[PDB]
Enzyme design. Sequence first.
Site, PDB file in Angstrom:
ATOM      1  N   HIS A 120       0.803  -1.226   0.000  1.00 43.55           N
ATOM      2  CA  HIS A 120       0.000   0.000   0.000  1.00 43.55           C
ATOM      3  C   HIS A 120       0.848   1.296   0.000  1.00 43.55           C
ATOM      4  O   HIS A 120       0.274   2.383  -0.106  1.00 43.55           O
ATOM      5  CB  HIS A 120      -1.078   0.030   1.095  1.00 43.55           C
TER       6      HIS A 120
ATOM      7  N   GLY B 153       2.348   6.057  10.148  1.00 44.34           N
ATOM      8  CA  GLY B 153       3.767   5.971   9.825  1.00 44.34           C
ATOM      9  C   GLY B 153       4.447   4.708  10.342  1.00 44.34           C
ATOM     10  O   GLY B 153       5.612   4.445  10.024  1.00 44.34           O
TER      11      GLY B 153
ATOM     12  N   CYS C  79       3.407   1.597   9.646  1.00 49.48           N
ATOM     13  CA  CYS C  79       3.251   0.537   8.640  1.00 49.48           C
ATOM     14  C   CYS C  79       4.614   0.035   8.171  1.00 49.48           C
ATOM     15  O   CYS C  79       5.527   0.834   7.967  1.00 49.48           O
ATOM     16  CB  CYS C  79       2.419   1.035   7.462  1.00 49.48           C
TER      17      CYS C  79
HETATM   18  N1  LIG Z   1      -9.344   3.029  11.530  1.00 50.54           N
HETATM   19  C1  LIG Z   1      -8.403   3.525  11.107  1.00 50.54           C
HETATM   20  C2  LIG Z   1      -7.158   4.135  10.602  1.00 50.54           C
HETATM   21  N2  LIG Z   1      -7.298   4.590   9.228  1.00 50.54           N
HETATM   22  C3  LIG Z   1      -6.717   5.714   8.808  1.00 50.54           C
HETATM   23  O1  LIG Z   1      -6.707   6.751   9.467  1.00 50.54           O
HETATM   24  C4  LIG Z   1      -6.046   5.650   7.445  1.00 50.54           C
HETATM   25  N3  LIG Z   1      -5.454   4.354   7.119  1.00 50.54           N
HETATM   26  C5  LIG Z   1      -6.244   3.623   6.115  1.00 50.54           C
HETATM   27  C6  LIG Z   1      -5.617   2.297   5.747  1.00 50.54           C
HETATM   28  C7  LIG Z   1      -6.412   1.292   5.198  1.00 50.54           C
HETATM   29  C8  LIG Z   1      -5.872   0.071   4.841  1.00 50.54           C
HETATM   30  C9  LIG Z   1      -4.519  -0.132   4.992  1.00 50.54           C
HETATM   31 CL1  LIG Z   1      -3.828  -1.663   4.522  1.00 50.54          CL
HETATM   32  C10 LIG Z   1      -3.697   0.843   5.527  1.00 50.54           C
HETATM   33  C11 LIG Z   1      -4.249   2.056   5.948  1.00 50.54           C
HETATM   34  C12 LIG Z   1      -3.419   3.047   6.747  1.00 50.54           C
HETATM   35  C13 LIG Z   1      -3.360   2.562   8.198  1.00 50.54           C
HETATM   36  O2  LIG Z   1      -4.196   1.786   8.662  1.00 50.54           O
HETATM   37  N4  LIG Z   1      -2.351   3.091   8.932  1.00 50.54           N
HETATM   38  C14 LIG Z   1      -2.094   2.898  10.307  1.00 50.54           C
HETATM   39  C15 LIG Z   1      -1.462   1.770  10.832  1.00 50.54           C
HETATM   40  N5  LIG Z   1      -1.262   1.535  12.137  1.00 50.54           N
HETATM   41  C16 LIG Z   1      -1.707   2.441  12.998  1.00 50.54           C
HETATM   42  C17 LIG Z   1      -2.383   3.629  12.626  1.00 50.54           C
HETATM   43  C18 LIG Z   1      -2.885   4.563  13.567  1.00 50.54           C
HETATM   44  C19 LIG Z   1      -3.505   5.704  13.148  1.00 50.54           C
HETATM   45  C20 LIG Z   1      -3.646   5.977  11.790  1.00 50.54           C
HETATM   46  C21 LIG Z   1      -3.200   5.090  10.851  1.00 50.54           C
HETATM   47  C22 LIG Z   1      -2.564   3.880  11.236  1.00 50.54           C
HETATM   48  C23 LIG Z   1      -4.054   4.440   6.699  1.00 50.54           C
END
Ligand SMILES: N#CCNC(=O)CN1Cc2ccc(Cl)cc2[C@H](C(=O)Nc2cncc3ccccc23)C1
Lengths: 305, 298
Positions: free
Chosen positions: A41, A143, A145
């Site tokens: 991603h 960040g 990921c």
């Molecule tokens: N609920 C909810 C969170 N979703 C979002 O704010 C945007 N995210 C969509 C998304 C969708 C799918 C995939 Cl594979 C990746 C992503 C990315 C994602 O999940 N990153 C993150 C990973 N770990 C901790 C995090 C904490 C806070 C914000 C983002 C984090 C960015």
Amino acid sequence: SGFRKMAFPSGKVEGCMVQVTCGTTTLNGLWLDDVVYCPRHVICTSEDMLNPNYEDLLIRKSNHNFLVQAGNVQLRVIGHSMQNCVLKLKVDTANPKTPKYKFVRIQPGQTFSVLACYNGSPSGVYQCAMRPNFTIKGSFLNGSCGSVGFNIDYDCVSFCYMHHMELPTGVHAGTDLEGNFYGPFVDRQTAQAAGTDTTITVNVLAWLYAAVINGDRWFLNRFTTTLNDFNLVAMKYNYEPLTQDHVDILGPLSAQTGIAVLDMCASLKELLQNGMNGRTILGSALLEDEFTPFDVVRQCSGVTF
Amino acid sequence: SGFRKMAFPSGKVEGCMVQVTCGTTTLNGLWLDDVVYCPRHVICPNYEDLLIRKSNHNFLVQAGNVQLRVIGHSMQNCVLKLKVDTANPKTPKYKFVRIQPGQTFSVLACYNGSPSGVYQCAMRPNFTIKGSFLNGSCGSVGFNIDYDCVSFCYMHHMELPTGVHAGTDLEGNFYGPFVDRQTAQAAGTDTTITVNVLAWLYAAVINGDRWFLNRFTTTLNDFNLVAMKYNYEPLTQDHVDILGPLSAQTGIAVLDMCASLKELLQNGMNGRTILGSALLEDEFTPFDVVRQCSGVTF
Ligand SMILES: N#CCNC(=O)CN1Cc2ccc(Cl)cc2[C@H](C(=O)Nc2cncc3ccccc23)C1
Ligand SMILES: [Cl-]
């Protein structure tokens, strides 16, 4: 004496962490030999996440669109391929700090250490378990990921997890290092919810044996149970079913303390019924399920107090 | 999201761990530049008398599969300093610092000069640490990291009868009224680190846990009269000042959070949890909460 949630020393993994930037997205990569592994991603925009066609996004990219940074040094990307949900970036330099390693896919209930990273820089290390609903209760911000999970038994690093996303309830989902997700999750921003979570029964039993090894027996009773009767009770408290494999795995701890697995099961049944009555077990007021039978044997003394 | 007891990455410290053997005793040493630091009880008490009989070759120092040659030795408080002929090429940027009770640190638990695990812990008000150590763990070290610099703050020396641990700073001065010998030594009655519980309550609010908040506030004196009764450490104006940033981020004043903590002490959690815990957690400082809820890297 004592019992802490202990992580493996992170040094061998720290020497593999890099920063991967593709366009406006920046996340972490794992540099082993001449390959950098990261979540696919990284090639997505926020808009793309709703229904991304990774094959269509990847075909439009060249090697020089991927910026890889290892400390203060820029690594040159000379190839790229996708394997399931991970992107594999061929770099021109092999990591001189590559440890002895294996990629292993774990099962729910298994534990591992997480080196949480941001911008290719490690910031902290903590111990986790793969929950029965395939999620992890981690501590991750945007960040993070590409942060990885691992075990280091002997001198070999077994990479088992790569962080991909956070679900609406604050829990985390990711893949093994071959890009196969744990659980029914997709690297897509869709209606995805973690299934109802359950307590890892074999791990609670292991932790009750660790309490006995450290000198605490207040929770034992004079009863025993059949395996079926135990499961009928434990399912009512959202506990995972205990299988014959679990009973077999608890064999060494049973022989060390002199407490038969089904007698420890009777004690767990009673703890679920009564609670702790203001008492603690290994400094905890809840029944702990993120220590496996193998973690207890590794941390605890071989001599029962 | 999420809140874990997080330790600093241990790599910079792992590259300093060595095995020190003197006679029948084997324990861990910290190799920084051309000096190996370890507990002086490795020679075991009249430490001047036992040390004067020893020669450099009596100390066997092993770094991985390589034997280091000891060319000198001196004692500084409860710490033995072994001059070796090779400087550690993996010596990080470092300082020796003495911590105060309530402050937290990471511990790299080692056996036979080999690191086996890393965990986070706090210096208790009674100066002991609730660690996880077995025989052979002596010489294991505690540390914090600020940017690229490792601040060594603890070296493990012993286990007390209640299962808790005692040790020194890297200059050999014990934390607590402990001595390095076999005698009747007991940890004093411990108390709860109030400023740390408040920080953890702010971390719960940041992560979306607010059931414990109320409309009330308290004076510092009234809160302290209540705290003295539940074996909680007195909360000072410095503690209130240190909690300033977390108060401004959540919109909950420190004496507003103190009114919530007073209610949790007088009435319990009523079958509920805070950050997955049924007890009030005191091993996260205000700075640890800010760091974990902001992603500071090393
Ligand atoms: N609920 C909810 C969170 N979703 C979002 O704010 C945007 N995210 C969509 C998304 C969708 C799918 C995939 Cl594979 C990746 C992503 C990315 C994602 O999940 N990153 C993150 C990973 N770990 C901790 C995090 C904490 C806070 C914000 C983002 C984090 C960015
Ligand atoms: Cl497994």
